[PDB]
From Swiss-Prot, chains B, D:
This is Caspase-8 subunit p18. The modification Phosphotyrosine is found at residue 113. The lineage of its organism: Eukaryota, Metazoa, Chordata, Craniata, Vertebrata. Changing residue 139 to A: Does not affect localization to lamellipodia of migrating cells. Prevents DISC-mediated processing of CASP8. Changing residue 139 to S: Abolishes interaction with UBR2. It comes from the Eukaryota. The modification N6-acetyllysine is found at residue 3. It comes from Homo sapiens (Human). The chain holds residues 222 to 374 of 479 of the full protein. The active site is at 96, 139.
């Protein structure tokens, strides 16, 4: 029996950094969620840790564009995980 | 060989998916949100989350257009639950939002912190030492992330 | 050449979650920094991605105790990286 | 295999180390801080940091007991440099602090965001596309974290 901080083992998957917007194509979903999934179903079988995946989602999302107002979207995951979090 | 979070449990754990689409409620009550459109396309998000998380042996638990109030109620449930035979807990929220808060379907505000904190250790021993994931898909303000050039990658 | 969001490639390593204290032993230094370095030393050579090292630091620090005020300390990274970050 | 940030560069990049210790100014000025203790022990933090990042081929740039103004002054320097030949940038801060802020050695305060937001892609394009790491080591409130039991790990 050991002790750990009240707030441990958490993981927030923010879709965008504060003060900014998020993008959702009414024809296929939100950039973030869609990428989240795609990456999830892809890397998970390969046994990749979640931070690793979330990092990639960070990548994929970064390359999207909203030409209209020449916009971008920056997802930002925060965490308190204490060990690798893989989803076998 | 670094430590790893355990994930073997038959149904790994619950995967709440609070998905809000119809914000007619909001539009109708809170003035300053007079023009918030319905999140046309969430369903697709919802589905994808459903599929992929099901395949990862997670028990889905969808909920549509939940007012702030409803959201709390919902979390409150999973909060008092006994996740003893659960190895993890995922909660996804798709809705409109603003600086540090998501919007109920009623235009009400829910600080993201308020939500996540519902599942601490004191607030949910059944989950102590277990991964608690939250995927929020909302807006955090009305700015546009300006992009800059580079071509490295 | 291409485009990426203004706030990409950031990594914030907070020594604690909000509204809480972080500890500093005048004897050996602070729980966080000391633990961050220690790990960096033992891990970077191997090849461990910074998120990995940062996770372990979340661990080590979690097992520390302020026996007196029966309190704890939980570090909390936040990141926008788009690629694994290793230090050869 | 997966993409990794290029870390080949000669000096790799700078590694700031703002290390605050003597808080007698704050004590004098700010009333509510009449009793903040000096940060004994930092020397050790700075040392450890210095070595570990030296061995990692980074060019340390220490600074001691800096008021909030000095801190900005300093960041504005590296904020204005040409990191074109640099592969990364690390900035460490050791000082007292509060909800989302760091404390200058004079009691004045600086939002973590202000410091962080100084090296964006626009503000410092000579760094765009390269990792910008920050290690804030300070308190973020006065609540001793709780801590619950469980034997897992």
């Amino acid at each position: 029996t050991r002790y750990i901080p009240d707030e441990a083992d958490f993981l927030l998957g923010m879709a965008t950094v504060n003060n900014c917007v998020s993008y959702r194509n009414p024809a296929e979903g939100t950039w973030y969620i869609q990428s989240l999934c795609q990456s999830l179903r892809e890397r998970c079988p390969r046994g990749d840790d979640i931070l690793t995946i979330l990092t990639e989602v960070n990548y994929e999302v970064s390359n999207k564009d909203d030409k209209k107002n020449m916009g971008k979207q920056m997802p930002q995951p925060t965490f308190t995980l204490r060990k690798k979090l893989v989803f076998p | 060989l670094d430590k790893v979070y355990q994930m073997k449990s038959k149904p790994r754990g619950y995967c709440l998916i609070i998905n809000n689409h119809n914000f007619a409620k909001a539009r109708e009550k809170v003035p300053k949100l007079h023009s918030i459109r319905d999140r046309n396309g969430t369903h697709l998000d919802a589905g994808a989350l459903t599929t992929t998380f099901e395949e990862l042996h997670f028990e889905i638990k969808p909920h549509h257009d939940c007012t702030v109030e409803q959201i709390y109620e919902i979390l409150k449930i999973y909060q008092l639950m006994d996740h003893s035979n659960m190895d993890c807990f995922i909660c996804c929220i798709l809705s409109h939002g603003d600086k540090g808060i998501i919007y109920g379907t009623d235009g009400q505000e829910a600080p993201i912190y308020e939500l996540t904190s519902q599942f601490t250790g004191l607030k949910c021993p059944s989950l102590a030492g277990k991964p608690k994931v939250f995927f929020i898909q909302a807006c955090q303000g009305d700015n546009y992330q300006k992009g800059i050039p580079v071509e490295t990658d």
